[PDB]
């Protein structure tokens, strides 16, 4: 079969790896850079820490976004079934458009939710705006996951 | 926790440090400190030798168990001991330089068998044995130290802590890794 | 010869790029402006919801990337023309690397605008107008990619 | 000087690609035939080695990040130097993840017959072990660095006040989700891959 | 510390020379092992005597 | 924060430990309740100062000896942190001490115009601003023979770029000009060092802490020039640093500020310094804003600006302890709560 | 065949010897950035 | 396998006979050291005996 | 041979480049001059709709890129000459990498002009004068790209 | 099946197994020896208990030496690509692991021997941290010694 | 095919790199730890002849390179196997890039140690003890290269 | 085949390299240690001809490179073997890229030794001895390249 | 044996003989000129005594010029590839060694004319160090002349 060559799972497992590595990279930037800002206010008003763990949770959801598409790419890969190069390019693209989506969303959550938590010890009215900017910066990875799911269902 | 440590720490040491030659050296340099503990007690000890002489009885057990387990292995300065009768016989008539197998006659009485020494696939068998050994001894150590939690919650007379932590912990640990440790023994039991 | 087997590669990376670079620009525009929002609403709490307009303005860039990437995704085929893959690659780059530019512009304008609008209340209308001039760049990229994607599969053959 | 080499390699790649494309020979730069004709044992062994290498370079990374600040923060408050060793432990488990995935991958590493050597399954299980070693080593790298950073902040917030370590251990938990998720994905990727036959 | 190394040099090399003399299969039994047993035992037993000379000389120190 | 703890892992965690010894508001209220300098010593002995005045024993204990020893242990802690520093960190520690070297130069060459003895004008010098040729500034009077003999081998040598020696030797009027101009060139050089080689989290929060030093020095030069100076604005603009938040529009209006209102209307257009010149003690306004800028520099973790934010906060702590011990020794307690505590 | 000059074996020796040389350049840039704390060695 | 149960009987009966005949001076370390060490010696003996009772891999060498 | 299969690639990356490198110069001219408006109109907010002329002249060059991207887009085909792809790549680069220069010049001149036009109000007519020279650099690239695109499909064969 | 370029990967694996491990051990010796020399000018009686980080860095290089010796006894002129790439993997594993473990021992060791002179309770702390960083070289040695056993089968 | 024409290239690079990178390592070890000698023997020149041990232990690394370069040089030939060239390349790199590390460690430890040994004379024994662990790195590289070079031309065809 | 057309390329670039990298190392050793002479012989002008030793020992490196670039050159020739070109490239690199290291180690030692030996007269012998240990690196590169160049045309067909 | 692309290496050897020696001479002239024009403001009598580093820099460019002329007059269309390789080697030998000689002459000349105004006895030391720095380019001249003497010796 000229449409299903034997090097096609290379681009599917590359889609798995780009969906997992870059999304957990974004999740790790988003949890580490924000945990810096949460622990920075550890002494000055310690009672605002357990309320401020939201940019850590919203960063950890970005790894679930990559986990879902990595499971759904790895479920379409078998050495006995035929696997087109179209399918491999499509899995490469759907991992690649969720990995950098979650990477950018994790950079945005990490840069927002430590400055916000670090200024939140002065003004206690910041929290609604902080959560709102975190929602706007966390739907960035949801957009990429939507594109990845539509692209996975299209390419198979 | 330092009353189950007195056997398990030298024994978990000896599983990692298994050799009758190095074990006898360590037992001998520990017994040198045990027999001379009166001249060394009234003496200024620097920190390294204070560490070594404060534990002159942890090293005696760490040598005494290392001799036992390196007699379970055939490892005497990485050599075998042809003490018992082997469970494997080699063929008598074979060409020089060819790969041959051994036929199983019986089972080796005490410890690992000495026909695995200069063997190509002996290291695969030692990998399987020592991996399953580590799994079963870790299972035994964990399910022994988990009963002490029940004895603690019983001495505190807290049935709420028992039914909330010990029983859902017991039938979670034993239903997965107790089943794994049983399955290793049952695969060893069948032919 | 005219619709080769490696032809959906260009359309696939064009569908990827319109999310990658667009979400990168939108993330810059949300992050750098949210730093200014969280830095100026310490002593100006009542301006907390007037200052979200840079962040919303940067989220519309990612919506622009989302629309074009979905509309490219629903034209990828196995027996696809190489012309179609080239057009989808061009339409993906045209949204991605222009939404990155508009996100850079909104991220650099919006934090200065929310830092000056807390000090001067009449600077808010100027901030909104400069952000419209900054968002229209990504709007131009979306216009180019929607006029371009409509030409993929018009006179394709073989 | 490194930017000069990055530009020079880019110029040489563009000149070589346009020279190969203009002369009607542009299909000679053939990445698919490169994937078909390189040995699957390269990809398999390279994936195993990079799995256990890049898990350890993230584990050891996190160990010095939350070790040096633990020892610095323990000068005035030495009552952290044993309790806070769980931050070393959380960034050390990402190496045992890569180790127990590298051994499971090396179990799928046998001698394939030369008549069916570049087959469908043998090449599949080279690709799968390569990218499933990469996605575990890189994930444990990034997880070890993130847990090291969020343990270095915890080691100083512990020495500030004792009740803060419990609150900032949660960030280490959410950071150590990542290596376990890489552990899951690398086992799902090489789940259907067979041995070399 | 030379008397400890010399006492182990007596004991270990005497056991090795006896296991070469009796043609024990953990020392002679392979193809890569030496062919003649007592020919190796004769040069290991002399080394055992040399370490015994070192043990007696350093035993009076 | 990924490459910080290679050379700066041990350095930060000890400085973060030194931060926890900053006295809180309750530890200041417990100091304002004291009746004797001995009671204040015993109250400080329960803090992280413990037994620093142990070699005094209640008889020679004055309110200046407390300021001597409490700052001396600050200086020894700074030297311990500096001895473990290497690379860009050690250079950053040297650039902090350059601003004290400038003050010791300007204090050493005024003790020779007044012909005060060299052994007593050096015990008033600052211990962190020590260079090996500091006592040898008592050899000449004019600026050129003190530069070309002594101050060439010092690291203050690139800072003598605009000090125009017109062969008038030295009065007290131009040593302050040389001091302000050296500090101007130093603030320029250390801002360019922070912008150039210091990493990004310790860059933005150190440029603000250093631009505040430039703005405070600009306001102090432009406000002390009313009473004891009659200078032209073209010669006054060489004394104002150009790195700060206040330079491009407001230091021009501070240069041609001939009256107090020329300063006040110039500082009314800047947003965070307006209201300083209206009510209250201006020096307390600058010290309060310094501590509010040093407080939110500890809240960023992997930063070498924590050393600056620690030593300026610890200097303010020594100033607050000195003010309290001055209040409880001279029996004036109307302004004992004039300390500054953000910790 | 893949090529006659850039064969299947040369081109995957130059990937192994590029990965190893990348790790070498990274590690040498780590050891090159190693400086001594001179203030804890002087008298002052 | 019954020559593992037959050794478990003579180890368990010995440990029960030592639980009741431990010296009264240091009971909680006589019947804790000796009874646990017999358990661990029997565990490593049973593991090293059952891996060779029915083996799947035969010893294979070339040089003999 | 004269109209190969890879021939629309250069036309697609010339349609894409004429908005990418144009909008990322227009974004520099918007951002670098908008941080000069938001930092100046905190004290002179009556000059807000007068200092915004650098942002408008930075938005004009993006329209210069948009026109050339549309005119290159509507001349793409599956079977077009490789000469047409080369000409469209040349037109896209001529607009993009010269509108990038015009945007850099507008961005550097505009914030220097609006920070100086509030101290001296007679510098606004000088800012407009320098900014017309900075803005005609993109109009020159538009002239070159339109003269290329008029030559694209004139006497093409095969 | 057994080409002419196949012992390149085994020889370069035997090279890298000692090269990267000695680079890591050299960083762990030098950076933690700077801390020993800086610490022991004011408190010199801690000189021979602070010597543990350079000993652990030496153990790392011994772990790399073991893999290099055990790879170079399986090299031949006519070995397969299987043996070649499995020796390459056995080299890369212990190389990256010894390099990482030596970097970690070097960065932890000087901070530990500096905190041990100020607080005496940090000696047990630095030893318990350095033991976790020591066994990472063991974690690469395990994969190296497992890939060695599958060399010629 | 087993003995190609481009086969002495890797052998000549292995003969070169063994002396090149050990000369780099020994040069850094001489340089960095000789700056410390020249800085600390302007005040106490009586201990000039005992601070020379970092320089000597650095120069041992160049002898480690020289031995392997001579032993690779006297095994080169026109018609050698490609296996021999690969083994000589590996033995050249195993001495060179390991003695480079050993020389880095000797230079850093020697410069940190001869500066601290003039303030504390008890630090000299610790400096020697750390430099032995720094010099056995190059010794291990020498062992690896000798075990390769014995294997180089053994059963070649 | 065995003596191809591109074979003297490696020999000519080795003959070039053996003087290029050698002169670069000797130029660093001359410039870096001439800075120290021009800085300390302003105070002590009587020590010009005494502190000239590191510049001379930097020039001896360039002499080592010259005597190998004039021995590779007369062993060059059209239709020489590719083995001969590889050996000449290796002997070029062994002198050049190790005399580069020896010149680094002569310059950055000799500048500090000239800075120090104007204060302490007993430091001059230590400077000479460290510079001998730094110059024996280039001597070792010379020995490796001479033993290598001796086998360039030895029984080569 | 004498291909068509053979004078490319000879043209690069003719270019690189003057290019890199001019770069070295330009570094030497620039460093020494900054030295002279900063040390002869106050001491103008020793202006013409300090021009010797600039002359030593110019002799490096003369060394490059001689080799480039001799390589230029041995070029040809139908020359051997051996001749092109020897001319490339002779160009690089004088060029990248005159570059190093120019670096050394510039650094030594700057450091010597900035300190020779303070100490008049330092001039005969500066001349002596610049002789060793100029012999570094004389060595590349000798190697280039001995290469170019054998570029057409036994050539078919």
PDB file of N, CA and C in Angstrom, chain G residues 31 34 36 41-43, chain K residues 104 108 112 115-116 119:
ATOM      1  N   UNK G  31      31.178  22.704  33.259  1.00  0.00           N
ATOM      2  CA  UNK G  31      32.450  22.746  33.980  1.00  0.00           C
ATOM      3  C   UNK G  31      33.204  24.048  33.707  1.00  0.00           C
ATOM      4  N   UNK G  34      32.565  27.109  36.290  1.00  0.00           N
ATOM      5  CA  UNK G  34      32.859  26.729  37.664  1.00  0.00           C
ATOM      6  C   UNK G  34      33.907  27.688  38.216  1.00  0.00           C
ATOM      7  N   UNK G  36      35.698  29.820  41.740  1.00  0.00           N
ATOM      8  CA  UNK G  36      36.151  29.592  43.107  1.00  0.00           C
ATOM      9  C   UNK G  36      35.747  30.786  43.963  1.00  0.00           C
ATOM     10  N   UNK G  41      39.123  32.318  51.084  1.00  0.00           N
ATOM     11  CA  UNK G  41      40.483  31.811  51.068  1.00  0.00           C
ATOM     12  C   UNK G  41      41.523  32.862  51.414  1.00  0.00           C
ATOM     13  N   UNK G  42      41.155  34.141  51.429  1.00  0.00           N
ATOM     14  CA  UNK G  42      42.075  35.225  51.723  1.00  0.00           C
ATOM     15  C   UNK G  42      42.027  35.585  53.206  1.00  0.00           C
ATOM     16  N   UNK G  43      42.944  36.467  53.609  1.00  0.00           N
ATOM     17  CA  UNK G  43      43.021  36.882  55.006  1.00  0.00           C
ATOM     18  C   UNK G  43      42.094  38.056  55.290  1.00  0.00           C
TER      19      UNK G  43
ATOM     20  N   UNK K 104      40.833  19.829  34.464  1.00  0.00           N
ATOM     21  CA  UNK K 104      39.927  20.834  35.019  1.00  0.00           C
ATOM     22  C   UNK K 104      39.825  20.713  36.532  1.00  0.00           C
ATOM     23  N   UNK K 108      41.161  23.517  39.281  1.00  0.00           N
ATOM     24  CA  UNK K 108      40.233  24.149  40.219  1.00  0.00           C
ATOM     25  C   UNK K 108      40.605  23.834  41.667  1.00  0.00           C
ATOM     26  N   UNK K 112      42.147  26.524  44.357  1.00  0.00           N
ATOM     27  CA  UNK K 112      41.425  26.722  45.606  1.00  0.00           C
ATOM     28  C   UNK K 112      42.217  26.261  46.819  1.00  0.00           C
ATOM     29  N   UNK K 115      45.755  28.567  47.730  1.00  0.00           N
ATOM     30  CA  UNK K 115      45.389  29.853  48.307  1.00  0.00           C
ATOM     31  C   UNK K 115      44.916  29.708  49.742  1.00  0.00           C
ATOM     32  N   UNK K 116      44.357  28.555  50.091  1.00  0.00           N
ATOM     33  CA  UNK K 116      43.876  28.319  51.434  1.00  0.00           C
ATOM     34  C   UNK K 116      44.907  27.651  52.316  1.00  0.00           C
ATOM     35  N   UNK K 119      46.946  30.239  54.611  1.00  0.00           N
ATOM     36  CA  UNK K 119      46.246  30.707  55.797  1.00  0.00           C
ATOM     37  C   UNK K 119      46.070  29.596  56.823  1.00  0.00           C
TER      38      UNK K 119
END
